[PDB]
Amino acid sequence: GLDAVRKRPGMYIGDTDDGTGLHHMVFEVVDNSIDEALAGYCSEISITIHTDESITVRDNGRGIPVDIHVSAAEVIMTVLHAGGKHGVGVSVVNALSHELRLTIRRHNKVWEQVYHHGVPQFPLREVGETDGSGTEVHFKPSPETFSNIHFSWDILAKRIRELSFLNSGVGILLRDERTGKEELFKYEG
Numbered sequence: 001g002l003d004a005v006r007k008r009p010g011m012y013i014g015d016t017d018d019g020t021g022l023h024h025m026v027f028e029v030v031d032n033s034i035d036e037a038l039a040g041y042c043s044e045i046s047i048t049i050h051t052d053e054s055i056t057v058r059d060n061g062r063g064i065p066v067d068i069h070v071s072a073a074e075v076i077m078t079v080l081h082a083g084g085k086h087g088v089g090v091s092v093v094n095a096l097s098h099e100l101r102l103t104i105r106r107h108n109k110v111w112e113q114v115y116h117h118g119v120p121q122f123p124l125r126e127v128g129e130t131d132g133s134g135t136e137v138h139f140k141p142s143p144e145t146f147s148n149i150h151f152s153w154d155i156l157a158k159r160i161r162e163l164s165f166l167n168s169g170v171g172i173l174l175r176d177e178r179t180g181k182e183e184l185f186k187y188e189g
């Protein structure tokens with residue numbers, strides 16, 4: 001389970017001391033929005049660095065399926081092994097965040113779930129009406145995992161430029177609330 005991730009984090013997320021693992025936290029979450037853009041359902045992605053060095057990734061895709069009739073969203077946020085025999089998954093990000101809030105806008109409803117170190121505080125639950133669809137993940141990297149909790153504008157921006165070329169017409173906004181800086185990365189092909 002996620003306990004093993006918390007015990008050997010660099011094995012899952014990358015080096016936790018040289019900046020690799022910390023920024024991989026963002027890139028693992030973002031990859032899901034990129035997949036949603038490649039699928040043709042997402043045209044806007046934003047990545048926000050907050051003053052407390054937490055991160056919000058938000059997209060305007062279909063939203064994670066809820067599939068309650070344990071929610072599908074809880075499965076993808078908490079299960080490490082999908083079964084059987086590259087890319088570690090958002091469950092690793094969850095395990096290594098001291099708190100993470102997932103908000104889904106889908107099928108006229110807003111669903112949310114909160115976790116601490118990957119452990120759900122409560123089940124995914126509906127909390128209101130919405131007119132959009134999409135997914136938002138707000139995570140706070142664990143300072144007990146990363147001795148340096150500070151994000152690098154240059155590192156994120158370099159990777160976002162590479163990502164932008166893969167999806168023409170998909171805007172990726174990088175917003176740094178620590179400094180007031182923001183930049184829209186948008187490739188037109």
Ligand SMILES: CNc1cc(F)cc2c1[nH]c1ncc(-c3cnc(C4(C(=O)O)CC4)nc3)c(-n3ccc(C(F)(F)F)n3)c12
Pocket residue numbers: 029030032033036057058059061062063064065072073076090134135136137
């Ligand atoms: C920050 N945004 C974000 C994070 C994350 F962490 C997962 C997703 C995400 N944005 C998404 N937007 C869409 C999907 C999605 C929706 N529907 C499918 C389905 C399809 O067949 O295309 C019906 C199964 N796959 C992916 C999604 N999800 C990424 C994984 C998953 C899922 F389905 F496994 F839960 N949803 C994510």
Ligand code: NA
Pocket residue numbers: 041060061062063132133134
């Ligand atoms: Na949408």
